Design a binder for these strands. Structure first.
Ligand SMILES: [Mg+2]
Ligand SMILES: [Zn+2]
Ligand SMILES: [Zn+2]
Lengths: 47, 50, 1331
RNA sequence: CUCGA
């Protein structure tokens, strides 16, 4: 019912929630455990 | 006759209608619905008959 | 080339136009001013910068004609090719074209059969759409929401495929089949039976057929490759001060390239979906901000806080390429100066300054200076003009002579607004014009300016001598009256020269000729006014070609003798023997032109101007303050009106009269008081008592200096002398109400303070009306030219045997348009004969001109059938004989003249000038038509029908009066009786509409129940009441189904007959059916049963054919009428024919007036309600000859009342141009209910159903279209795209594959070609034939 | 925008 794109963008970003202090530590631990599987699984290759 | 075609019932359900008339396409909260009707008419900078 | 084609553009076509993909948003460099690599200005893609140079400068000098440098890639060619090379941008996502999306209708939901409100939820990334569903729980194009897609993904897995964005609509258009839906809709179109859907399914079927006929594919609606304009049509030029100055397409293009590169970068970073869904939305917004700016959402603003002009804002409006740079250009060899009057000229000459003709004719001067060897080259011939030497001004007199030059004055309203004169050379700085052509130009010498255009070639120089010279335009194309009628000063001189005093210094003497009357006037022995006896010799040429002299002593003045040395040979002396006002001079010039030719008329009109200026200078006609004479009985009339207003005032101060009576009494006693002074001043002005030859007191018409300007028609009327001696009449405040007290003071005695402030409402109203009238009167002319642009005389004769029938207008009182000038000029259709019904006096097709039309005027003929433009049978133009007479020249029109531009200019030019009892007037016979009538009880006649009109015939046959008479009037006379002027022949009530019974027998009040079906009302004063019924809404709502039918029967009860037929007679009951005469009464015929009671935007409303708000409805077919279903606001009525198809019904709201009742009979095309009628229903029910006769009797009552003469032939041209698109109702050749041309649906029957097969049938029905719509539905789309709605016309003609043909003469003006009319029309046949 | 026809 609108045509201003900034209202569409802010309405789309409005659905998600802000993060607390420990939430960023949780997501950083997720990223490190995502890359650590690639690190410890490349050790069985000749490359 | 106006009080029957009126779809609202309460205060917090009537500011939402003014918000959806003036700012369509944005989902309203109460804290931003009160401030629109306050700063529309009853603010010392946004309204002036002078 | 000979045809322009237009269609959609495939991406292969855009790659075939392109010269290289643009990749970077850079325009130029900042230190040096060079275009950058792969920019918007790049030298590799669009060509080099300078002539025959690359960028690096490795190649120059024209030796390398077409090499490509290996360093910079620039192809060495001219810099001219920067205006013709295009580039393209490879979009990283498909995006929708805004023209095929958000025009109205949608054109992309018209194909998909989906609303625009549903498509825009998919183009914006808001809701998914299902392309295909393997399990049919999800249908095609069923829009899912954001969260519903998560349920549908888990309930099915990957059996369905849903997408979101412009690629969803692209895969939706790509995965459709036209050949399934075409046959499906073509089989369900002739299965269903409705009207509301068959006006849409036909359009969808025609769109699907036009897609496969043009060869397009529906995937090209969605852009994938966007083309770039060449970089010399959107330039970037450095100004003088070092600041650059760009066009604004280098901002929108730079936005598209920037956001496209950012989308290419975001798709390789593996970004989340909230970023990519926003980036694709921004790319689509930046694309349609370039194609058409203010359509999607908010308009894109630059840095100036102004909306940037997009690509669609460059071809539309009054600033596009169409309306400002293609139809009208700025031309070379042109000039501009202030005009001034000079009377020493002839009719074909004009002045010209020396310093203007030295600049216009400069290359002619160079070509003449080089030929005589006076300068060896052009660079040494320019110095001889820069010094203004001796030999230049003697070469200019050879260059200028026999070389015409045009003279245009803006605004160029009509055809005479541009004329070609033969120049002379005067010193000064002002174009000297001839004083007689100022009536054509409408040029007052008060600071006007005129433009000077030179023709260059040898063909155009011959089109200014034989086509546009001012001695050829002495007749207006609007009407046969002259346009070189003399103006104010010369007509005052001719009025003063032809008068007579009483004593006059030597009257009664006898003279030999006119040449001894100038010798008497010049020596002073006899005055200019006298009464003498001269001996003249006039020539009458009624001998065929030969001139017979005859001599007689005439009793005349001296001035009428001294004028007669000017008049040519063939004219008689009765043309100068009168007082010679303004109408008599134009009548004399018209008589000379009709009798003698063109070559004496120019010399006569020049000598009249040379004489009227001379004998007005010798007189001296000065306005003094002693000339405005107050009537001496003026204060008495004003004192008497001031007495009579006080009686009404004191009657209002007590209670005797109301306010609305006093307000009209004051106006009615001031109007007669104003006219009693306006009579007195005029009766004092026009009479002067001079001494006779004896001592007597004889009166003559006066020699007052301000009456002679009013009587001679030079300046002013009698309405403006009243504001100089009598009182100002009654001013009106701008509410519209008239102020009570008037301005009792005039302009000689001087106004008051309040009377001058009251006098400013009218002047400001009339001055602010002209500033808003001319906009509509100059917009109507533009709407009129662009409809009738392409109507040129093509054939010479077609045998059509039909045409409309002429009749003088006879409304109300006297005739307003006689037959002598209404039928003049047109050929006849059928061989009309004498009132003794044999002895054919004029043949079938002869040109009715003078010496033919007064022969009709001698006899008593009244209705001649003439050929007309609305019934010609040729294609793409009308006959020469079906048109009539060329009103400018005076002969039959020639094959090649564009009619419709002359007709449109002739209608649209004077639009800025525009803003009971029956009492006969004379003695004659009485005729009636379509009349059923019975005698009354007393011995007179009553009338029981609707179509009857009382037509007074004279003693010879022509209808002098035509009077309407309604149903149920009681006449005083019978049919065909001798009458007396002033007598009353009809007596009928104005307010009520009675329902008088025709039957001579008893009555009985049958079938009425008081309380449930009818009501009761007793006459509270007299008592002679009866059983009445209430109105529609006020009555009981319990008995609206039980119809109260007062069935009149005798004392027995037997059904009495209608007179002449077996069926019984009843008298039914509508609302307000108050009957008077009691039950069981005996009546005769003529006995009442009941008496039921009751400017220029008009022209722009007629030609637009707008249906009015309250339309007078008409009955569709013949038959008897009864009301059917009941009032749900609108109760039906059926039209059941006696001999036809019963079940046709209708739907009447608003039960004010029903001219038919529920037992009466009607016809096709009559009145059911009353009021104005819509012009569509006149075409649908009555013939075409009743629409083209309704308009030329309705728009000719706007121009006639204002006093503007326009010949009726100029209106039938655009009425022919209106009813041009015709819809078919049967089939057999093309389709079912599509709207084709009437010219293509006539060529088919001229081919198909003659020798190919039998009558396969292409029966159509004509359709009427307004002038804003009959030009947006032509064949050639270039003639529509320059008029109005360029976006809709170009979009509608691009998905259909429309092919232009360049038929008319507005597309040949755009492409720079010879128009197919006039001198180009002879050449155009040698192109059309050899092809 | 102000002015002229
Ligand atoms: Mg002027
Ligand atoms: Zn190079
Ligand atoms: Zn014809």
């Amino acid at each position: 019912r609108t045509t201003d794109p900034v209202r569409m963008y802010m309405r789309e970003m409005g659905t998600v929630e802000l993060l607390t202090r420990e939430g960023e530590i949780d997501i950083a631990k997720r990223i490190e455990d995502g890359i650590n599987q690639v690190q410890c699984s490349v050790a069985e290759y000749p490359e | 006759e106006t009080l029957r075609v009126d779809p609202t019932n309460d205060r917090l359900s009537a500011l939402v209608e003014i918000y959806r008339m003036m700012r369509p396409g944005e989902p309203p909260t109460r804290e931003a619905a009160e401030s629109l009707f306050e700063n529309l008419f009853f603010s010392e900078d946004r309204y002036d008959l002078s | 080339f000979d045809a322009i084609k237009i269609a959609l553009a495939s991406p292969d076509m855009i790659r075939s136009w392109s010269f290289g993909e643009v990749k970077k948003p850079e325009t130029i460099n900042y230190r040096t001013f060079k275009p950058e690599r792969d920019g918007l200005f790049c030298a590799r893609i669009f060509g080099p910068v300078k002539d025959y140079e690359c960028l690096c400068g490795k190649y120059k000098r024209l030796k390398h004609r077409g090499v490509i440098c290996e360093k910079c890639g620039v192809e060495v060619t001219q810099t001219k090719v920067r205006r013709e090379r295009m580039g393209h941008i490879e979009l990283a996502s498909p995006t929708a074209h805004i023209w095929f999306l958000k025009s109205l209708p949608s054109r992309i939901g018209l194909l998909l059969d989906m609303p625009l409100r549903d498509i825009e939820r998919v183009l914006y990334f808001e809701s998914y759409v299902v392309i295909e569903g393997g399990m049919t729980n999800l249908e095609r194009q069923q829009i899912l929401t954001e969260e519903q897609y998560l349920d549908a993904l888990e309930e099915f897995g990957d059996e369905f495929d849903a997408k979101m964005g412009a690629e969803a609509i692209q895969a939706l258009l790509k995965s459709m089949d036209l050949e399934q839906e075409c046959e499906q809709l073509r089989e369900e179109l002739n299965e269903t039976n409705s009207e509301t859907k068959r006006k849409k399914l036909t359009k969808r079927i025609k769109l699907l057929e036009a897609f496969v006929q043009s060869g397009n594919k529906p995937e090209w609606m969605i852009l994938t490759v966007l083309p770039v304009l060449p970089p010399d049509l959107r330039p970037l030029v450095p100004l003088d001060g070092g600041r650059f100055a760009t066009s604004d397409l280098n901002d929108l293009y730079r936005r598209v390239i920037n956001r496209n590169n950012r989308l290419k970068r975001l798709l390789d970073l593996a970004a989340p979906d909230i970023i990519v869904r926003n980036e694709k939305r921004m790319l689509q917004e930046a694309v349609d901000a370039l194609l058409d700016n203010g359509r999607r959402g908010r308009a894109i603003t630059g840095s100036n806080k102004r909306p940037l002009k997009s690509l669609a804002d460059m071809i539309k409006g009054k600033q596009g390429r169409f309306r400002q740079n293609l139809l009208g250009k700025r031309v070379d060899y042109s000039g501009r100066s202030v005009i001034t009057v000079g009377p020493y000229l002839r009719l074909h000459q004009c002045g010209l300054p020396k310093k203007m003709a030295l600049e216009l004719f400069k290359p002619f001067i160079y070509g003449k200076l080089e030929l005589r060897g006076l300068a060896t080259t052009i660079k040494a011939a320019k110095k001889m003009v820069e010094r203004e030497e001796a030999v230049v001004w003697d070469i200019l007199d050879e260059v200028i002579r026999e070389h015409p030059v045009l003279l245009n004055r803006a605004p160029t309203l009509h055809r005479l607004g541009i004329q070609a004169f033969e120049p002379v050379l005067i010193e000064g700085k002002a174009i000297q014009l001839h004083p007689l052509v100022c009536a054509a130009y409408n040029a007052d010498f008060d600071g006007d300016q005129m433009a000077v255009h030179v023709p260059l070639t040898l063909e155009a120089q011959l089109e200014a001598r034989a086509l546009m010279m001012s001695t050829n335009n002495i007749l207006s194309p609007a009407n046969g009256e002259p346009i070189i009628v003399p103006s104010q000063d010369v007509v005052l001189g001719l009025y003063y020269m032809t008068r007579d005093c009483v004593n006059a210094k030597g009257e009664g003497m006898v003279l030999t000729g006119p040449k001894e009357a100038e010798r008497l006037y010049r020596s002073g022995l006899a005055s200019l006014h006298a009464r003498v006896k001269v001996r003249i010799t006039e020539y009458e040429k009624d001998a065929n070609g030969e001139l017979v002299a005859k001599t007689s002593l005439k009793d005349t003045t001296v001035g009428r003798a001294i004028l007669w040395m000017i008049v040519p040979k063939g004219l008689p002396y009765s043309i100068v023997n009168q007082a010679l006002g303004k109408k008599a001079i134009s009548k004399m010039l018209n008589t000379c032109y009709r009798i003698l030719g063109l070559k004496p008329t120019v010399i006569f009109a020049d000598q009249i101007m040379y004489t009227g200026f001379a004998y007005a200078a010798r007189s001296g006609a000065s306005v003094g303050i002693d000339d405005m004479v107050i009537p001496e009985k003026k204060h008495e009339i004003i004192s008497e009106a001031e007495a009579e207003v006080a009686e009404i005032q004191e009657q209002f101060q007590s209670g005797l009269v109301t306010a609305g009576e006093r307000y009209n009494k004051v106006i009615d006693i001031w109007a007669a008081a104003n006219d009693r002074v306006s009579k007195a001043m005029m009766d004092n002005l026009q009479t002067e008592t001079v001494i006779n030859r004896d001592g007597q007191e004889e009166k003559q018409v006066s020699f007052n200096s301000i009456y002679m300007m009013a009587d001679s028609g030079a300046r002013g009327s009698a309405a403006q002398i009243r504001q100089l001696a009598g009182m100002r009449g009654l001013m009106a405040k701008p509410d519209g109400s008239i102020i009570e007290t008037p301005i009792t003071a005039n302009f000689r005695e001087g106004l008051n303070v309040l009377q001058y402030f009251i006098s400013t409402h009218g002047a400001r109203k009339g001055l602010a009306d002209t500033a808003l009238k001319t906009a509509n009167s100059g917009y109507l002319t533009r709407r009129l030219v662009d409809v009738a642009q392409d109507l040129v005389v093509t054939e010479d004769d077609c045998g059509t045997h039909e045409g409309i029938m002429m009749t003088p207008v006879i409304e109300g009182g006297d005739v307003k348009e006689p037959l002598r000038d209404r039928v003049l000029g047109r050929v006849t259709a059928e061989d009309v004969l004498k009132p003794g019904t044999a002895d054919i006096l004029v043949p079938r097709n002869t040109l009715l001109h003078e010496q033919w039309c007064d022969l009709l005027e001698e006899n008593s003929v009244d209705a001649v059938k003439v050929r007309s433009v609305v019934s010609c049978d040729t294609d793409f133009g009308v006959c020469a004989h079906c048109y009539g007479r060329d009103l400018a020249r005076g002969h039959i029109i020639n094959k090649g003249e564009a009619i419709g531009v002359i007709a449109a200019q002739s209608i649209g030019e004077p639009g800025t000038q525009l803003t009971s009892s029956i009492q006969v007037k004379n003695k004659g016979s009485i005729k009636l038509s379509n009349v059923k009538s019975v005698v009354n009880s007393s011995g007179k006649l009553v009338i029981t029908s609707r179509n009857t009109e009382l037509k007074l015939i004279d003693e010879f046959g022509r209808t002098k009066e035509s009077y309407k008479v309604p149903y149920g009037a009681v006449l005083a006379k019978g049919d065909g009786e001798q009458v007396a002027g002033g007598e009353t022949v009809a007596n009928w009530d104005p307010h009520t509409m009675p329902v008088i019974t025709e039957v001579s027998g008893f009555v009985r009040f049958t079938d009425m129940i008081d309380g449930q079906t009818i009501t009761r009302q007793t006459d509270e004063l007299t008592g002679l009441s009866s059983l009445v019924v209430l109105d529609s809404a006020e009555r009981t709502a319990g008995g609206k189904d039980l119809r109260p039918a007062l069935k009149i029967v005798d004392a027995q009860g037997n059904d009495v007959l209608i007179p002449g037929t077996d069926m019984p007679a009843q008298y039914f009951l509508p609302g307000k059916a108050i009957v008077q005469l009691e039950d069981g009464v005996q009546i005769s015929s003529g006995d009442t049963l009941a008496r039921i009671p009751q400017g220029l935007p008009r022209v722009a409303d007629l030609f637009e054919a707008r249906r009015p708000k309250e339309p007078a409805i008409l009955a569709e077919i013949s038959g008897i009428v009864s009301f059917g279903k009941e009032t749900k606001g609108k109760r039906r009525l059926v039209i059941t024919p006696v001999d036809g198809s019963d079940p046709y019904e209708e739907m009447i709201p608003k039960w004010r007036q029903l001219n038919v009742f529920e037992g009466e009979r009607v016809e096709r095309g009559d009145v059911i309600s009353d009021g104005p009628e819509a012009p569509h229903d006149i075409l649908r029910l009555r013939g075409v000859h009743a629409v083209t006769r309704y308009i030329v009797n309705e728009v000719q009552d706007v121009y006639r009342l204002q006093g503007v003469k326009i010949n009726d032939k100029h209106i039938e041209v655009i009425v022919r141009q209106m009813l041009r698109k015709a819809t078919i109702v049967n089939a057999g050749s093309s389709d079912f209910l599509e709207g084709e041309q009437v010219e293509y649906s006539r060529v088919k029957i001229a081919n198909r159903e003659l020798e190919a097969n039998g009558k396969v049938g292409a029966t159509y029905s004509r359709d009427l279209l307004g002038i804003t719509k009959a030009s947006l539905a032509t064949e050639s789309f270039i003639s529509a795209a320059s008029f109005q709605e360029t976006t809709r016309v170009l979009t509608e003609a691009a998905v259909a594959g429309k092919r232009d043909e360049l038929r008319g003469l507005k597309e040949n003006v755009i492409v720079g070609r010879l128009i197919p009319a006039g001198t180009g029309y002879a050449y155009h046949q040698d192109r059309m034939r050899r092809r």
